[PDB]
Amino acid sequence: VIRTSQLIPEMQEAFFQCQVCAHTTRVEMDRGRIAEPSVCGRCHTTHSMALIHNRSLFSDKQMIKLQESPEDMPAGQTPHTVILFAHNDLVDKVQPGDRVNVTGIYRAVPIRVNPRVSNVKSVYKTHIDVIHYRKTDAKSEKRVELLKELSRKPDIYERLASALAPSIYEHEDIKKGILLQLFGGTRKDGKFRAEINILLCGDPGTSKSQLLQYVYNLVPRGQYTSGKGSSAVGLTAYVMKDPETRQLVLQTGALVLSDNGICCIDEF
Amino acid sequence: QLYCDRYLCDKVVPGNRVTIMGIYSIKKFVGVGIRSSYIRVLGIQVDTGAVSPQEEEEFRRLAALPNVYEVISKSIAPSIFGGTDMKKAIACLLFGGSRKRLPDGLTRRGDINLLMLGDPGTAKSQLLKFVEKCSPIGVYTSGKGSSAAGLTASVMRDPSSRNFIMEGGAMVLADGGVVCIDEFDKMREDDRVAIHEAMEQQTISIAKAGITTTLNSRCSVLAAANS
Amino acid sequence: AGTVVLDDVELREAQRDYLDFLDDEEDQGIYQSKVRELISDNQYRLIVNVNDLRRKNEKRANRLLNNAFEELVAFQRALKDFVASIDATYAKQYEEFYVGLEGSFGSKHVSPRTLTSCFLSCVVCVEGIVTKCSLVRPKVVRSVHYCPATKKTIERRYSDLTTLVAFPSSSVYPTKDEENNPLETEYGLSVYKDHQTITIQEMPEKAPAGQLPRSVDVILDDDLVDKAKPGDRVQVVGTYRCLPGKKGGYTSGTFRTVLIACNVKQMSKDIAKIKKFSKTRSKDIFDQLAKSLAPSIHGHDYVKKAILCLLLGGVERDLENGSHIRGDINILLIGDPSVAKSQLLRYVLCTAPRAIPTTGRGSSGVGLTAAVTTDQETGERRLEAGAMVLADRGVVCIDEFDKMSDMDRTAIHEVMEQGRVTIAKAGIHARLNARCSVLAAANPVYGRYDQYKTPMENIGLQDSLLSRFDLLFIMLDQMDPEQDREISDHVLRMHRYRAPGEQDGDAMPLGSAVDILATDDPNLHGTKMVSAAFMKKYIHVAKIIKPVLTQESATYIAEEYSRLRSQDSMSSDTARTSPVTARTLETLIRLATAHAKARMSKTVDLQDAEEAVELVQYAYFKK
Amino acid sequence: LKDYALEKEKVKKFLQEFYQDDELGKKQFKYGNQLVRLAHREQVALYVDLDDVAEDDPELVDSICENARRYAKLFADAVQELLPQYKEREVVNKDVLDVYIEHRLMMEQRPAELMRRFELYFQGPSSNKPRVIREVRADSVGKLVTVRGIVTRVSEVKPKMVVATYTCDQCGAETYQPIQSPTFMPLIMCPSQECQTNRSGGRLYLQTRGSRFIKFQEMKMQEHSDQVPVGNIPRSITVLVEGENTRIAQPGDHVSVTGIFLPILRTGFRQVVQGLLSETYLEAHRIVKMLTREELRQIAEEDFYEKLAASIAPEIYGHEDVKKALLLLLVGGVDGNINICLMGDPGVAKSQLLSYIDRLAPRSQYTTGRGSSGVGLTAAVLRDSVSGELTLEGGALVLADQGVCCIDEFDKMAEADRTAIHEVMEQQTISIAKAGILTTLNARCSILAAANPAYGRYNPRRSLEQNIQLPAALLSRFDLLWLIQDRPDRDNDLRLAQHITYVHQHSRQPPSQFEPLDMKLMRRYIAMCREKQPMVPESLADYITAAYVEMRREAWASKDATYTSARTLLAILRLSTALARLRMVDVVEKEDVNEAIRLMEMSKDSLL
DNA sequence: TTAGAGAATTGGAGAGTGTGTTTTTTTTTTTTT
DNA sequence: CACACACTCTCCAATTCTCTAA
Numbered sequence A: 001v002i003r004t005s006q007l008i009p010e011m012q013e014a015f016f017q018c019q020v021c022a023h024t025t026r027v028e029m030d031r032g033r034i035a036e037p038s039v040c041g042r043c044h045t046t047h048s049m050a051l052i053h054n055r056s057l058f059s060d061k062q063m064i065k066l067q068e069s070p071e072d073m074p075a076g077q078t079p080h081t082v083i084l085f086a087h088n089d090l091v092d093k094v095q096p097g098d099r100v101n102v103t104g105i106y107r108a109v110p111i112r113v114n115p116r117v118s119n120v121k122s123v124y125k126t127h128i129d130v131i132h133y134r135k136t137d138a139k140s141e142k143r144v145e146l147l148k149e150l151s152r153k154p155d156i157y158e159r160l161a162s163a164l165a166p167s168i169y170e171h172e173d174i175k176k177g178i179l180l181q182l183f184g185g186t187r188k189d190g191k192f193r194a195e196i197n198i199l200l201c202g203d204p205g206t207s208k209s210q211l212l213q214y215v216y217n218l219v220p221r222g223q224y225t226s227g228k229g230s231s232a233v234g235l236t237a238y239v240m241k242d243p244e245t246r247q248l249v250l251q252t253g254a255l256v257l258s259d260n261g262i263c264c265i266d267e268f
Numbered sequence B: 001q002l003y004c005d006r007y008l009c010d011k012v013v014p015g016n017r018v019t020i021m022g023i024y025s026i027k028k029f030v031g032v033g034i035r036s037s038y039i040r041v042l043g044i045q046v047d048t049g050a051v052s053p054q055e056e057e058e059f060r061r062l063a064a065l066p067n068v069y070e071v072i073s074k075s076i077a078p079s080i081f082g083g084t085d086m087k088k089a090i091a092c093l094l095f096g097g098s099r100k101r102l103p104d105g106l107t108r109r110g111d112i113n114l115l116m117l118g119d120p121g122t123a124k125s126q127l128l129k130f131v132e133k134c135s136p137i138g139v140y141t142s143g144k145g146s147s148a149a150g151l152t153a154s155v156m157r158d159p160s161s162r163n164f165i166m167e168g169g170a171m172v173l174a175d176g177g178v179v180c181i182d183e184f185d186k187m188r189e190d191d192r193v194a195i196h197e198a199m200e201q202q203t204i205s206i207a208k209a210g211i212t213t214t215l216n217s218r219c220s221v222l223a224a225a226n227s
Numbered sequence C: 001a002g003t004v005v006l007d008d009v010e011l012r013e014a015q016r017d018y019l020d021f022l023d024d025e026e027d028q029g030i031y032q033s034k035v036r037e038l039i040s041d042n043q044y045r046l047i048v049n050v051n052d053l054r055r056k057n058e059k060r061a062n063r064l065l066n067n068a069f070e071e072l073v074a075f076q077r078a079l080k081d082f083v084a085s086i087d088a089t090y091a092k093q094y095e096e097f098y099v100g101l102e103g104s105f106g107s108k109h110v111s112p113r114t115l116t117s118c119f120l121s122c123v124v125c126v127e128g129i130v131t132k133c134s135l136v137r138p139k140v141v142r143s144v145h146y147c148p149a150t151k152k153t154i155e156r157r158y159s160d161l162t163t164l165v166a167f168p169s170s171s172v173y174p175t176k177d178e179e180n181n182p183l184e185t186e187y188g189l190s191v192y193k194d195h196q197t198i199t200i201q202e203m204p205e206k207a208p209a210g211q212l213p214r215s216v217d218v219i220l221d222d223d224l225v226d227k228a229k230p231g232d233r234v235q236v237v238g239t240y241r242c243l244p245g246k247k248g249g250y251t252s253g254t255f256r257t258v259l260i261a262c263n264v265k266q267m268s269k270d271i272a273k274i275k276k277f278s279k280t281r282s283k284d285i286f287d288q289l290a291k292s293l294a295p296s297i298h299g300h301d302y303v304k305k306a307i308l309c310l311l312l313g314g315v316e317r318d319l320e321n322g323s324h325i326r327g328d329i330n331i332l333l334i335g336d337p338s339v340a341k342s343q344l345l346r347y348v349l350c351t352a353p354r355a356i357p358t359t360g361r362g363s364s365g366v367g368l369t370a371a372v373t374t375d376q377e378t379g380e381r382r383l384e385a386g387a388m389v390l391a392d393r394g395v396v397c398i399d400e401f402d403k404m405s406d407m408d409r410t411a412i413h414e415v416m417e418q419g420r421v422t423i424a425k426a427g428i429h430a431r432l433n434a435r436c437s438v439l440a441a442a443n444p445v446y447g448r449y450d451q452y453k454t455p456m457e458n459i460g461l462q463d464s465l466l467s468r469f470d471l472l473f474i475m476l477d478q479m480d481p482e483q484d485r486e487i488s489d490h491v492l493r494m495h496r497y498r499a500p501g502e503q504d505g506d507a508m509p510l511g512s513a514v515d516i517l518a519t520d521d522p523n524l525h526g527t528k529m530v531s532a533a534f535m536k537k538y539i540h541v542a543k544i545i546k547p548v549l550t551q552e553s554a555t556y557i558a559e560e561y562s563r564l565r566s567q568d569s570m571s572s573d574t575a576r577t578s579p580v581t582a583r584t585l586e587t588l589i590r591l592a593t594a595h596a597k598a599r600m601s602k603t604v605d606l607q608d609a610e611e612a613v614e615l616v617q618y619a620y621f622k623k
Numbered sequence D: 001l002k003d004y005a006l007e008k009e010k011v012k013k014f015l016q017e018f019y020q021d022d023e024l025g026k027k028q029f030k031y032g033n034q035l036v037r038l039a040h041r042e043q044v045a046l047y048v049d050l051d052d053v054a055e056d057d058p059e060l061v062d063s064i065c066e067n068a069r070r071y072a073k074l075f076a077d078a079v080q081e082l083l084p085q086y087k088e089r090e091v092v093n094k095d096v097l098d099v100y101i102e103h104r105l106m107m108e109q110r111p112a113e114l115m116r117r118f119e120l121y122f123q124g125p126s127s128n129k130p131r132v133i134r135e136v137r138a139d140s141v142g143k144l145v146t147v148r149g150i151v152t153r154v155s156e157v158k159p160k161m162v163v164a165t166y167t168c169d170q171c172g173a174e175t176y177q178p179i180q181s182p183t184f185m186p187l188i189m190c191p192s193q194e195c196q197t198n199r200s201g202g203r204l205y206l207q208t209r210g211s212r213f214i215k216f217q218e219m220k221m222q223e224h225s226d227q228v229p230v231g232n233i234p235r236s237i238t239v240l241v242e243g244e245n246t247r248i249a250q251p252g253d254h255v256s257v258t259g260i261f262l263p264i265l266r267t268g269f270r271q272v273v274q275g276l277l278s279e280t281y282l283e284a285h286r287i288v289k290m291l292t293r294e295e296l297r298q299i300a301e302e303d304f305y306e307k308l309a310a311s312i313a314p315e316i317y318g319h320e321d322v323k324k325a326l327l328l329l330l331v332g333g334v335d336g337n338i339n340i341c342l343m344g345d346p347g348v349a350k351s352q353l354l355s356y357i358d359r360l361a362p363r364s365q366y367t368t369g370r371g372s373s374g375v376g377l378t379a380a381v382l383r384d385s386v387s388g389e390l391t392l393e394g395g396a397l398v399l400a401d402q403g404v405c406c407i408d409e410f411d412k413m414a415e416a417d418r419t420a421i422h423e424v425m426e427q428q429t430i431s432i433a434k435a436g437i438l439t440t441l442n443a444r445c446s447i448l449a450a451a452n453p454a455y456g457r458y459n460p461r462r463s464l465e466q467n468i469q470l471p472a473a474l475l476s477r478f479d480l481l482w483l484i485q486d487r488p489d490r491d492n493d494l495r496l497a498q499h500i501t502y503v504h505q506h507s508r509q510p511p512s513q514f515e516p517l518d519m520k521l522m523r524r525y526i527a528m529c530r531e532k533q534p535m536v537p538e539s540l541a542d543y544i545t546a547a548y549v550e551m552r553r554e555a556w557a558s559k560d561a562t563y564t565s566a567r568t569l570l571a572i573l574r575l576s577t578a579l580a581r582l583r584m585v586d587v588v589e590k591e592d593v594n595e596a597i598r599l600m601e602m603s604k605d606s607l608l
Numbered sequence E: 001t002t003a004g005a006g007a008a009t010t011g012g013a014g015a016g017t018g019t020g021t022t023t024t025t026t027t028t029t030t031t032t033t
Numbered sequence F: 001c002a003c004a005c006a007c008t009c010t011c012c013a014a015t016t017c018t019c020t021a022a
């Protein structure tokens, strides 16, 4: 998924009211166009029925822009992309960056040459009406009962610390410190931080970055970013024009996004 | 805005002081009833390409008398006490040498470049302000207030048609005369290296935004600076 | 639009006069012969000399130049009659036979500045430099439509304000029969013609004092649609017209003016016995040419030899594996103030073909390579060539090269290394050819060269860039009184010179349109220094010789390359200007090839190899 | 000009009666045999060859070439009128439009262009020599032309409406609208007599199921750079491709397109404004793109490893060590990339290796790190502002995706590109914002870097990062760091100069008195040797450990503990597995580990 | 008491008139380098 | 420019009112 639009309301039933006598009627949607009443029924005035927008009925719609997977692209080619349209409950189930198997009906629709003229291009636009989404990159008492006795097992501290990052050769006190950072103190109120701050030092080519990436994959509300100015997501907060909308958005940095977690800062 | 017509076209150039005689009028093909105004020029008096014969023969007389060099030098900045050698050099700068093209096509500069450099309160700025007013073609600019583009020539797009055009700087506006660069020590070095070609070769070679040309900048540089 | 009625009586009189002019049989047969060649070469534009038309019929020539359109259609109809008389089969291949004009046009010779509204409807000859070209696009002149319901073909012919026709014409493309049936275009049976717009700019050296150069738009059609490209100095003969426009029931009386060209002439590069006699009679013609190269600059003999090698160029080699060796020779001059670097660059600008001026602070990378601009005709964005692209198969002279930005020199890296520049802008990702020699001039850091610092820190440029130049000369203002005496003698002699057509007290005139014929009117040692006019033609003929390398000269070059490598080894880190590499060997091959071109030898001899080795020795091993 | 009614019968006679001999002098009607397949829907595209037409009517060929589109329509009409003569089987309906047409026919028993499911194209005559794009002038409008060029942009295949099918809601009748123009007016109200006479007010609903679509694809061709004139920009032409001609060509492909050169039709306000001028496109009609026993007996020679390494750079002497390392670059380790960096003075045969490996590699690129004015190491956006559509170009790293990217002057790479190299070497992809929206590109490629010292010649007195001025975060990603030294050396210089002078005076490599393997044989060998996927045996783990620790401890004892890490062992294993692939054995062994260790040690020896 | 023939009023078909449209580079300036 | 929308006016004929016969 490359982008996901704002929620688009699609009219399902138009509500008309007579501006002369307040008599109301309802019109059903015929393949995207309204059969507007040209006359009122109670009275008989012509062109008196006005569309009451917020008494009409609407349903959710959303546009999604979906790129072919990197694992599926042919060698050295720029990726292809399709447009999906989801409606009702399937609208708010997919975010940008997700990988999905989408089942839907492959539609083809005309596009008018300019908005005030009904001539259409011979070459049709295509999109997929979404019928089903399946995410394919996602990866209680029965746990509490295990954890209660495992907590009173001997040297559970050492067991958890050694469980941290099995893929690297062991630095006992580093792993112990990261474990105590994960658990943290107790937050109470005055103003004292329960958060624990840890710093790792060493040459490039040490296991410090592997530790950072591991615990970022582990912890909830985690973040991973570089102190270098070329980082994917910044540490500080900033304001930017949302390019697909042009309206301002306050992008709070990783330190604010990790307000109840661990912020991993590589190249500090 | 001025509308000129028939023989009033090319009667003036930028930098000229004029007295315009004309009809104040609206264009006739921010607000509602707003109309853009201009003057339809009916006459131009350049305040000051021709000398009357009386001026001409008087100039012959003035050149003929034997102490014309001393008379000119005493005419340079008469309100300034002293500095006779500096005034004489300024007279030489005002009159200039002779430009030449040699048989192989190479050009030799004719204009004279003069730098005044040193103590404050020594009337350097007054000499520049005199020379800018006395030279037939003359522009005064501060070194601090100038840039490379604004001195030589600048490239910019026109809102009326999306294409890159050139606009002349100080050197182009003073082509055929003198540029009086006051505060010459204050300008940036990157801006100061812009005028080397225009000082010696008396040309400005621009290659920017696709437009590639070589303008003329046949002008003297009279510069004032401090230690 | 475009249809105009003409008086048939004067049209027939003019057509009679022009057919009499073209039927040149009883006289020398010049235009009989030219129309025969027009038929034979499969051409349909005849270039007529108004000098000949004035000799035969002076009043008709004057009326032609002052009443261009009606007289030109009369002339073209006469030409169609005459070509039909010679070959009636060939006359039907083309809808119209065109006439372009050459010769002297009197007062109609103009520049874009003096081309005022008084010249509208006249034939004018405008001399200038091309600054823009649009893309060649087809223009419908005659469309055939097949009506499938009615089973008949209609044929319609068109015109616009640009295309004045003197026959009835439309300007609306039909889509329905008179019975309201649909019409199908027969594209193959329709006729279209190529159309392009260019802009001709005033020569900058001829502009008045405070002024920027002015411009005129030119419309080229048919064979003329790609006869001039940007940077060409050209003479365009055509009819000067205004285009009366309208905008929704209203017109501003301001009309744009265009030159509808009828003839385009280049002003560059345009018998063998004198050159053959020169190469056979002279001993070391390379030396005579080199010392004759820039007379107004005293000394700098080796630099003049190197610049002559740059002008002659090496030979371009393409190998069976697709690897490539450039023929262009690149020269860098680092030196003190007032050692004539700029004047040498200006000489090469004045004398070489397609020599592009550039300076470090006056230019940018975009202007050096290529820019996005919008075609004013269309509005679409497209590329516009920069200086090094315009300099393809030519020279770019970069003065003040040390003052240039590194970001600007990034482009010069690709151009010098590979002879190309790659771009990704507008709708186009492309590889433009920039096969140009570079003649760069720079000052050392600290202005004046410092004897108590190494050459590689006097030269402010990095060795990666310095590797691109074949030759690197250090030019020092040695204050030896002997050289000062002879240099000052030469300089004062130059400053005492005056031209022959000029009085003793004359100040230098500002330029004007003094060229008043489409071809040169006046048209090997000096008036034993070689003449400049001869030397231009000689270098033109010598550039195309393409001599082959010979085995003994190759052996000599190999021996001397290995010896130069040993000298590089023994040299201290202060006693060299550049290290010796395989590119030094390539430089030796290129310089020997250029010397062979100077001799017009067709084979690289030991004579060439010796001078190449001497020049490389001189350039490389200095401090 | 001609009577098209008679021309259609001439075309029918050609299609029915032309014959050619294919095998043993047997006579076959090449177009009747294809009309049979067209009638049976076994074949959809019919490429009629005007070289075949020339064998019995050159005048018809001239008429077709001079008025091609008219004759294309005539040939299509003739073929459609001929297919019922060649019907002899029932069609298996596989398109939903086949099913709809089947029920349409049954209901008619109870739209010619609609019933027409085939497409006819002229394969150009050989007398028409291929033009360049610049030579396709206005005189050739409406005429069959062959044009050579570089494909530089290709759109996705889109559905182009040919015949719009509608259904009425009131009278239950189908309505058909053939579409010739690039735009059309949709039908709103039913034109049937039953609705019109009754004033029924019944409207029309488009049925895509019943309508006919055709595959459509726009592309841009560009001039060959060496064919452009000296001072000029390369010209470009739009080619509109339909049906079976779609998907034949991709960007970067050298193509020759036979087609019809036509002006673009305009609607609304464009025809008002443009006047007599028109843009043009080429209507594509045909697009053309421009060991095991015998050499195994050669490969059986024990030379083969050194034979390949010698063939990797025959113009260079003494560097067989480096050539073997670059062989392992091309082979790659077991899944896997192998990255190499070469350091040396400017003006040395270090770019020669980049050139050779780029030439030999099947998928490759060869750029420079010095901030290209084109598409850089990473992707870039093009606006195409005749229409304004943004489009994405790959760059070096993306265009060398499943191969090798050669980077010259790797040190002068800016930080914006160094971060991209980090992205490639860490996770083998790059990411770019097209219009504020971010798209991800594959780059699963091995990097062959060549750096130069920041200032002056190389100086072993200083450290490597001091020489090159590039951080250890870059330098540690590489598997072999080589110093390609160059000293003056009299006899070697003499031989190099003799070699280059022979190359100049003969335009060919001198006889070296060695027979290297040809480039195609080398390519087939590397594919055959990289098809293998070896595995390291567990019994060799102790020996790998011993070699790694002794190399590590030698670095401790003799070179002040210069940097090494676990990626050193990983690089040794990747090199040994690449050697196993090269030897075409699916088990790694002592000799592979020894040679990997030796290769790393000699690269460090070149540094020291 | 229904309904049908002649006269007048209202519905709407259609003829006529008017409106709107088809990333890029050089330069400055403050802050940050 | 010229090809679609948007809006007004006019005429034509179809329906309903009025007066008469079945």
Ligand SMILES: Nc1ncnc2c1ncn2[C@@H]1O[C@H](COP(=O)(O)OP(=O)(O)NP(=O)(O)O)[C@@H](O)[C@H]1O
Pocket (backbone or CB within 6 Å): B079, B080, B081, B082, B118, B119, B120, B121, B122, B123, B124, B125, B126, B127, B224, B225, B226
């Ligand atoms: N010799 C003089 N005769 C008359 N006025 C003088 C003289 N010297 C200085 N002044 C006056 O001193 C003031 C400063 O003159 P100015 O031209 O600015 O000198 P300056 O050398 O340019 N000063 P500075 O810009 O600090 O170097 C003016 O009001 C002059 O009139």
Ligand SMILES: Nc1ncnc2c1ncn2[C@@H]1O[C@H](COP(=O)(O)OP(=O)(O)NP(=O)(O)O)[C@@H](O)[C@H]1O
Pocket (backbone or CB within 6 Å): B108, B109, B200, C296, C297, C298, C299, C335, C336, C337, C338, C339, C340, C341, C342, C343, C344, C441, C442, C443, C487, C490, C491
């Ligand atoms: N050897 C010479 N013979 C004749 N004229 C010379 C010589 N050296 C310098 N000149 C003259 O000195 C003037 C300045 O020359 P110029 O071409 O600017 O040298 P330059 O080194 O390029 N100046 P610069 O840009 O500061 O380095 C010109 O008028 C030259 O003709």
Ligand SMILES: [Mg+2]
Pocket (backbone or CB within 6 Å): B124, B125, B182, B183, B224
């Ligand atoms: Mg002052």
Ligand SMILES: [Mg+2]
Pocket (backbone or CB within 6 Å): C341, C342, C399, C400, C441
């Ligand atoms: Mg200079």
Ligand SMILES: [Zn+2]
Pocket (backbone or CB within 6 Å): A018, A019, A020, A021, A022, A023, A040, A041, A042, A043, A044, A045, A048
């Ligand atoms: Zn109502």
Ligand SMILES: [Zn+2]
Pocket (backbone or CB within 6 Å): D168, D169, D170, D171, D172, D173, D190, D191, D192, D194, D195, D202
């Ligand atoms: Zn219907």
